[model samples]
Target: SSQGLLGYYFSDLNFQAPMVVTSSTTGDLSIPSSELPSENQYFQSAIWSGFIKVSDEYTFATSADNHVTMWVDDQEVINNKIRLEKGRLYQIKIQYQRENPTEKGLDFKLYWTDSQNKKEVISSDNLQLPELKQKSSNSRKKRPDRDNDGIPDSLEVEGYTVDVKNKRTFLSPWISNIHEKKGLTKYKSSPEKWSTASDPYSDFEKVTGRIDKNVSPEARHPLVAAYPIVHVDMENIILSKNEDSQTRTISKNTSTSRTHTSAGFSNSNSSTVAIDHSLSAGERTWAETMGLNTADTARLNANIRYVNTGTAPIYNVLPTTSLVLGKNQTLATIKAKENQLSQILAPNNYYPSKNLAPIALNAQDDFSSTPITMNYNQFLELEKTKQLRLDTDQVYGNIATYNFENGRVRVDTGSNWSEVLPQIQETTARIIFNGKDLNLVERRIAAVNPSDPLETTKPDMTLKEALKIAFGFNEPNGNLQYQGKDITEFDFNFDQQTSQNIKNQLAELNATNIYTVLDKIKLNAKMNILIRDKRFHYDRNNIAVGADESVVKEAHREVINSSTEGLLLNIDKDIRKILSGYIVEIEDTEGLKEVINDRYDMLNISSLRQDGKTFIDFKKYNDKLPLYISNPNYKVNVYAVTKENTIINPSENGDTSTNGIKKILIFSKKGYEI
Candidate 1:
């Protein structure tokens, strides 16, 4: 299983790359603007598709951290949805035809996650489009006109930057060259457009469920436009060593000037404004713009180094050392170490007991080990249990099922869907807290600082000041009680600077700053259908009469509609087997049988019995091992019960019905039995 193959693969220093170079804009799920609900608009299932190329298959393996499904020739070949290991060869044969669109131009990419809840991506790169194979050639001009205009659409799309100087061309810094040609004044003076919409649907109601089938659908989201952010190193500001008597500052600045002395930064009370971003064309720039001043024309020496680029070169930093696990040890040795480690950390690890262990030093080990208190297996089981509870919970839990009519999932919490889905229960939860009338609860603890009496005073309330205390803006109809008094509007925004400060403070308070914007929100959500039918009992009254509709009406539909529930199954068997192993299910009748057997401690193979049936009687049986007491004879019967029994029927069926059942039933035969 190559579940987290890519993630851990890149985690190695050899394959080191940015986890995420940058994040693209996020897309939302919504209906099309032009379509109506009845015309495939309101309710629809989401289909996520991605394309990737398999650069090298031989070195690839299934990642243990993710779930993936691959289809080759329209048939799923690799289904590593759970714990997957990696292998080689990434060749894919696409089979697109008239009825099915299976073609060689196949590319697929699906996202998963790493062990640290890091949303790692697994993608393919070998897929090529139909037009990607086309070769470009110089086109003939129309009637050999004076102006030779034969630029192709592809060249134009690249901003006509592809150089024909050499056949081996590399990507150039397009924006940097543009900036050099336009000059810094024209670049920095202009104010670029930037999107600032807080929420697209700020005024729209937060409604759940599919839209009306007949009503027209429209795009409810707002349009957003943003510009690229430009970052300049503030520390790169050039300073002059020579200080004037009147102004003690660095009287120097330029885009490429590196001549700065120690005194320039050390002795100055204030520094010079080296770069003026808002400078207009009218201003005559000093430093590099004028080349050099007349008085110090020869004095201003160039201390800058300019490195010319021929092309972007590639260099391989090969691994100098490799870290291998359990080099000379076998699987048994590793298992023993794993058990020892589990025992060592049994008490307080201060974290979840994941007990995560690697498969092997290389690619040739099975990905199975002993279970722990809290681990990936436990997480999967807990997630499944949580999903089940959410579906059946009576309070604050509800689920949406796929709609057959609309071919989509619909949340059916309201009465509008009551007729269609009356079996689904509505979740209800309410939290009530009286803000006007306070009901305070207190706990005894040491004062902030026992040495000082003022430490226990209201002035030292750090937490209360940040939360309930008002800051100019009124509390959401609540009061801020300090010591025993309430203070309103302590302090808040007075200007744009203060507002910016408040925004930063709030962002830090919410901990959004710690999370990456690119990571996906992972959640386990699935529903399983249960079905059962069996031969329990037969109805006579319904079967005998034609109108009664009993036994003969339908084979077993009579008892099939009983109160017994079946098993849990999510996906189809073929699709499921392609990825993970078959889901283990429990028998329904076992629930009652389990209750009856719960008190039967003797029934357990390794437990003691109440009827003196134990290994303690082996002492008495030991005497029979070397017993020379006497030869005993008894009446015996051999009968073929099951097909595997082999013997023919020589026994009386009325006497014993232990045909299929396995047991040692001891009974003495009387003299009259013969």
Candidate 2:
């Protein structure tokens, strides 16, 4: 749409009619104040209307030689000047006229102030003819417009309202000043500016929309809707309407003497039955110091009920042969029975402390003869000969010979028999075996005379007597006495490597009495008992009962191999019970395997090497008991029971047998306790 050129008709005062073609003048109107579209007649009038877009408040002004007027959106905005806002569609109209055609100086011009504050002519470039409204095909009732500014009153609040007097619409007071406030500026602007605004009404849209949708008309305002005022009726509901006030004054009743009696039931003369709730921390400390608390004590006894009975196949029983003492045995018999009970139980056979080491039999000769004196030729021939013949009407047999070169006499029979029985008749007849005369030999060998004794002949000494003198001893077997005396007993627990070390050390010393020495030797290897407290800290996988080695020191370790029973050495019933609370159950091999698996599940089994195999640390559950591995070549079974001669499980109440030899079979059942 474009602005129209000024157009008019030369006609009479009835200007309501359309312009007549014969008297019409139409042409572009120049803006000089003294110019006119044409020589105006008394009934002439000029008009132009078009649209223009504004970006900001724009001031529109016109100067005319005659009366003039302007309308925006079909409403009179100004007779001379007006201002309009941005971002709106405005249809502006301008009108001017003169009553005389001779009024030659008629002039008019239109202009406006743009957003740049620059004055610009209202020309074709910035103006357009008003667009024609399309007729509605449906005959709908049009909405009423009070000011006839083309916008209905229902939607006028969204923008400016119609100004009938000024013939134009302008922003209301609130909308006009909205941008002046920082908060409202962003709120009226776009969402992008909201966050940076000093006090943006951030929740305004949300709150207004929510309340507008739900609030009742009577309480449309937020404050009013939040808390409505109440209108009470005429009647006042007051309390205590029936209450009566009594005004009575009387002197206090004369003071009366009163005696009160109180009594309490006492169970006994002593108040020990009363709980000492006021007991201090020290009292509790002392209570625990005196003994285990009842709970712990009960738990310990319960655990012991299992531990004392949980045996393994490795436990060795006492020998029945020694356990055969009669009930009426003497003191010596009792002592002997005790010694038998003290005997260490091994996998196979009995193991006494005295026999822990090896015993080697000493080599001794069965035959002995007096050292014989002989000639050199016979000595050489006898020593060289392996056999000899005796043919002088005595024994005519050849005998194995030895040491003829050492001036020893040779026998015709086998040397083993001849040496043993050289004094017999067959052997003595051939005293001179090579046919040498006995008289000659007898004559050659002269007896040495004793200076003081007047003896006619000298007596011959036996081989036993000769050996006694030769070895410088009182008796031939006297050396045997000291042979084993210096040897001491040796009992120890060590790996094969350590056992070899002991053997090497003794061997280096050439210990002829190794057996006796070993009996006295003590090994460095110590038996460590691991006690896991199952009850004390039952939730934990394992809890150590005592210092690992402390238990070993207080208790003696006995060899227990392949029996289901063992003694609780040295420990009293109380200690056993205490330990029982901590002792974990170690039963069959499968149970032990379970413990091992649970304990070392994270370990890399393939990484460990022991005894030429992948060795898992089965002793990981040592928090409970010692794990024993049997070494076949150790001369004893690997498994042993640690016990002392004490009756931990007594036969009856108060039965503390000083020399208890009876074996108490441990049993487990629920609710069994002292």
TM-score of each: 0.12, 0.17
Please report, in order, the local distance difference test score of every candidate based on alpha carbons.
0.19, 0.24
Q: What CA root-mean-square deviation does each model show from the true structure?
A: 38.5, 58.9
The lowest-lDDT stretch of 10 consecutive residues in candidate 2 is 300-309
Per TM-score, the best of the predicted structures is: 2
lDDT of 2 by residue, 485-538 (tens): 210111122334435645675777677554435333322211111112111211
Q: How many residue pairs clash in each candidate?
A: 31, 34
Angstrom error at residue 608, model 2: 99
What is the alpha-carbon lDDT for the whole of candidate 1?
A: 0.19
Worst 10 residues of 1 by lDDT: 187-196
